Ligand binder design. Sequence first.
Ligand SMILES: Nc1nc2c(ncn2[C@@H]2O[C@H](COP(=O)(O)OP(=O)(O)O)[C@@H](O)[C@H]2O)c(=O)[nH]1
Length: 288
Amino acid sequence: KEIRLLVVGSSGVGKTTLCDCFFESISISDIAGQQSFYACDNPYDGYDAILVMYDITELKSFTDLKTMWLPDIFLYCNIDTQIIIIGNKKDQEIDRIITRKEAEQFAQDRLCQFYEISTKDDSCQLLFDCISRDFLQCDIKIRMLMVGDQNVGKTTKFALQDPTGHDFMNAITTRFEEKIKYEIIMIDWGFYNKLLQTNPAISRTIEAILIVYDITNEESFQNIHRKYYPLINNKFSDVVGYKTDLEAQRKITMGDALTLADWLGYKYVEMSSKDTEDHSSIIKALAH
Ligand SMILES: Nc1nc2c(ncn2[C@@H]2O[C@H](COP(=O)(O)OP(=O)(O)O)[C@@H](O)[C@H]2O)c(=O)[nH]1
């Protein structure tokens, strides 16, 4: 149901061999060629994912995957979307000039996925499920930023990592939450600034923001282009004895989250409710 794909890459390897590797006998096929002129193109920017293929044994594939291919159709595609990066060949593995470590690190630091494939046998097909699974397991994904600092940010999840997470950058994915089967991803503060070393104006991809507050926070700073870049969108500040001047006053930023907060063995309420009814708040909006 609702499945249309696209496959991009250099003329070295574009989308071809997967036609002969389809061997069909969901997730229709191919395309990326013929069609025309921003008709089927930005319609393909309406449906799910796209595949970035590069022949490993030659570098210019990867080089102009970085400088040429990504930025055009990256910001063109919808918020969920994004791309899967795939090295080709790799059955040979000998003449291979690209270690997948640098590739995958560039990818996950572009927040984009990564895989390599032998399309001669096995692993090729073994990619498709690893796509469709996420497509079938998750109906809708949302991307959101967590800004803040110090202790309280250190406190507030899926229990992943620890107050020592993975050094200076990572992303955190959380399973589960009306039979939606959707998904959401939370992101480090400095990581937002880190991937616009790669892609700026990626603030289109974040449908929601989250802020944390401790006994001393001015918080007039992280909100510069937390204001300017996302603009209207959706927003929340969640941070028992709260301090309500700031609640009434310090949101001129408007947004939801009246300064919700919890600390207790009851802290379930906090993360659960906050991440949930906000999602239901986002979904109905839509509007392109
Ligand atoms: N070494 C290697 N080459 C492959 C494999 N699968 C497809 N090809 C090559 O792909 C070429 C044609 O399509 P391709 O270059 O990948 O895409 P195109 O540039 O858009 O035509 C053929 O010359 C094949 O040799 C593979 O598993 N290993």
